[PDB]
Amino acid sequence: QLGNKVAARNLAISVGVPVVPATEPLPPVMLKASMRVIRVYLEKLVERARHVESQILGDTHGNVVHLFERDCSVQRRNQKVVERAPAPYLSEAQRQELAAYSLKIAGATNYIGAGTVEYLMDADTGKFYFIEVNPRIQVEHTVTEVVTGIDIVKAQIHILDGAAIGTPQSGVPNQEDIRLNGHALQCRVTTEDPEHNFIPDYGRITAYRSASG
Amino acid sequence: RAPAPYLSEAQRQELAAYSLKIAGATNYIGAGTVEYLMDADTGKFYFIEVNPRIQVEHTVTEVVTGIDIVKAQIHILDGAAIGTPQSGVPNQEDIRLNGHALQCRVTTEDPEHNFIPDYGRITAYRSASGFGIRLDGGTSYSGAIITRYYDPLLVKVTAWAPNPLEAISRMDRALREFRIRGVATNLTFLEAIIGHPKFRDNSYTTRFIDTTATKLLTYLADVTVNGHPEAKDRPKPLEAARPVVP
């Protein structure tokens, strides 16, 4: 139900979440495989969009609560390159607007463990329109744990170990016990060399010294 | 650790006024510490020493309160007042607590050789990070030289947690994960401090401590060089199908 995005999009229309205005998987666009552009299926291609998303966790007792959104606007060739959390372009008022849509879909699937609901904000209008669901842990998961205090990878462990959200054995607080502290980003360091059209470099690393603190 | 786990909320707001009293009685500028001895029988406090500097242990109060202790010190003598957006410190009415942490100072004090340092070339240096591990090091790396004239502090591992006990296992995981070689380490003295039941539940005092493969490469080379006496002077196998288990 969360891989085939010819079969997840109407689920969003059901509980109240918008999706970007379109039509069914072939009888002003972009072409997605259940990518390129048009001038799988076809989705009203947003001109200037902002890729924002709710991270969710879910136990076996059937419960859901958001870990707040993430920004992933910055993309090379359509992929995540910079991954933020919270979403700094959001005022607080659009955030719980976003995090209400997402609370409900997460229910509409009886979901177990880590998984993201994903979206697309139109710069032009500042509104939201739902895209897909990533049904697992992501690369950008770490910008949430730190800024939300809750250990996500451990939590899918206790969450599948058999324990109720907001009980000492799940490693997951209750709703208002989940407080966003400051803002977090994540950049991936890669053997891609900007002076060799980003080709990645292989080899032996004769001395490494990272920065922490 | 930060905050003080064997404390309550009332014990939390008594040592906060003596801090205001001693810093008021001295026109205090910058960050400084106010230490107090506590009778594990009665629970009182006793003004020992204020240290008019930042500490070897500051980093554990930074990871819970969310405030850069060092950035304050800079704005403070710049001319910024406590509480503004340019002071880095929020007014007392804003500062609050946010989980549990603990730092262990990694040094070249060899647990298993009379706590005398090791010297010279480290030939490996792997640090552990991952969720909730602050690191303040940068003095150590592969091939570096540690001489003996100073503090032999390698890194400062600081682990934070949602709770005080998930703090220790996080700390004990880092402490273990580490790869250091060329010079001796107290990691096996540190992993013996944090798993001992007296640290786990807060039943320690100030006298907790004071009172509690080559061989293979060798053989290979040895035979590579001289040969095995049971074979070296006889028929060799063809130049050969390694046997394969069905």
Give the residue carrying structure tokens 């007392």.
B92
Whether the Cβ atoms of residue B170 and residue B157 lie closer than 8 Å to each other: no
What determination technique applies here? X-ray
CATH code at position A212: 3.30.470.20
Which tokens hold the place of A201? 């470099």
- Interface touch A207/B129, C-beta < 8 Å: no
Distance CA B193, CA B76 (A): 38
Instruction: Provide the 10 A C-beta neighbour count for residue A159.
Output: 23
Residue A143 lies in a domain: yes
Distance CA A72, CA A143 (A): 11
Residue A10 lies in a domain: no
Residue A93 lies in a domain: yes
Residue B178 sits at φ, ψ, to 5 deg, of -75, 140
Distance CA A207, CA A185 (A): 26
Whether the Cβ atoms of residue B178 and residue B191 lie closer than 8 Å to each other: no
Residue A198 lies in a domain: yes
Rg (CA), chain B: 26
Residue A9 lies in a domain: no
What is the tally of structural domains in chain A?
A: 1
Whether the Cβ atoms of residue A150 and residue A116 lie closer than 8 Å to each other: no
* Pairing relationship of beta strands A121-122 and A75-76 according to DSSP bridges: unpaired
> Which is nearest to B1 in space by CA: B241, B209, B204?
B204
Give the residue carrying structure tokens 């493969």.
B213
DSSP E strands: which ranges in chain B?
A: 33-37, 46-51, 100-107, 120-121, 124-126, 133-136, 145-146, 153-161, 179-181
Q: How far is CA B181 from CA B116, B140, B187, in A?
A: 16, 11, 12
Determine the residue type at A27. P
- Interface touch A209/B166, C-beta < 8 Å: no
Q: Nearest CB to A212: which of B132, B135, B143?
A: B135
- Interface touch B136/A212, C-beta < 8 Å: yes
Beta bridge mates, B108 = none
Give the residue carrying structure tokens 């406090």.
B45
Distance CA B103, CA B124 (A): 22
* B166 touching chain A per CB within 8 A: yes
Determine the residue type at B63. V
* A108 touching chain B per CB within 8 A: no
Residue A34 lies in a domain: no
Known catalytic membership, residue A204: no
Residue A89 lies in a domain: yes
Tell me which residue range forms the domain holding A206: 44-213
Distance CA A184, CA A79 (A): 19
Residue A65 lies in a domain: yes
* B203 touching chain A per CB within 8 A: no
Which tokens hold the place of A27? 């009888």
Whether the Cβ atoms of residue B171 and residue B157 lie closer than 8 Å to each other: yes
Entry resolution in angstroms? 3.1
Whether the Cβ atoms of residue A115 and residue A136 lie closer than 8 Å to each other: yes
